Symmetry: D2
Subunit: 123 residues, 4 copies
């Protein structure tokens, strides 16, 4: 359906790079590279998407997770993106995300950042 | 290494059931069963956790995704949970989540729900 | 003091209209008109802003609330916008918002929408 | 009817103190004292609530803002709480909040925290 649509390389407004493969069973697998934060190189990501979306012009729901540990760095944090893929000439993934840091119980109240990223197939 | 800590069955305050295995490499895999919403039986989930957390009493960052499609129902949506695992006699996973529905462009502004779930090892 | 800066008429990407006065004490007062949702005409808003922001190029923190009741409609809901004002040739208010509906205890899990609006001084 | 219900002193799970008056026109006014963060003493708050709630056992929607500047400190930030007031023997205000810091454009991605507070009439 959108499996072909989704699979490939995406960029967000920060210059981060998202490389993903969409499986026929709804799986998402790939790597993420962040242009910001104390992140370097590629980090693993896994997620899911609606492999049988509605056919009424709705987007396709999806989400994925990155834990910010790889062989170079550990930020002791994880981001999840939740959003929808929108096909067409200017195909986009529109997301909102939550970034939770490991914290003490005392600092739990400020453990979580929220934002929005838009991914396109170019730049 | 909260690998043993994380792996197993969890319940949230809504009576939902989260069954997960934590891999040594930081993978999360399993199934989710929602006590509420347009949902029935088990749905696949995947995610990531920090397999080398800080040793200072901080929690362990983690997240995962469910796409609300299985052999019974398709809600045309996906939830991501972002949060942290806290060990100890009453181990908890404390989360915030985003639930995005596939929508038309005109309804995109109301595509996404936000909430918080707390998971424990009993009920 | 972005008091001058903030006061006036703003528009977001949905074609909604925000009219606000900033008081020297940090008050925000005005009316909001939503292009979308179960809304008509103007609704009162109130909020606060940092009336003595950092001088280092940072934006100015602010937020406001609208309850979606006026003489025409009642949507039994309230939105808060939280964001920052950024001055300059293309002045912006960048926001994230939570919209909570009054619900039964059984539907509380889906009480709240989350989004992002960007406001500019034209269109 | 919740004017009376809402008006008064409230405490959240962090030991913060929220003092509010609900006006008949849907206004909320008062002060907030945070038990955590870079905060001391009282800060002004303003907001709105649905003064004509549904009669079907639904909660009453409301929200309010605090800018974290007073005569003692300036944290260059603002929190909005969005949620609902639930009446009865153990009356609650159940909220989700966004805390936005003033930042440079380069740090704007990490400008906003998200959380949840529950307020009760005791402790």
């Amino acid at each position: 359906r959108d499996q072909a649509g989704i699979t490939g390389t995406w960029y967000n407004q920060l210059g981060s790079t998202f490389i993903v493969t969409a499986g026929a069973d709804g799986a998402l697998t790939g790597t993420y590279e962040s242009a910001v934060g104390n992140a370097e190189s590629r980090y693993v990501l896994t997620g899911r998407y609606d492999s049988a979306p509605a056919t009424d012009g709705s987007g396709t729901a999806l989400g994925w997770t990155v834990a910010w540990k790889n062989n170079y760095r550990n930020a002791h944090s994880a981001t999840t993106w939740s959003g929808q893929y929108v096909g067409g000439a200017e195909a986009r993934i529109n997301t909102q995300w939550l970034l939770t840091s490991g914290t003490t119980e005392a600092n739990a109240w400020k453990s979580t950042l929220v934002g929005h990223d838009t991914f396109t197939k170019v730049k």
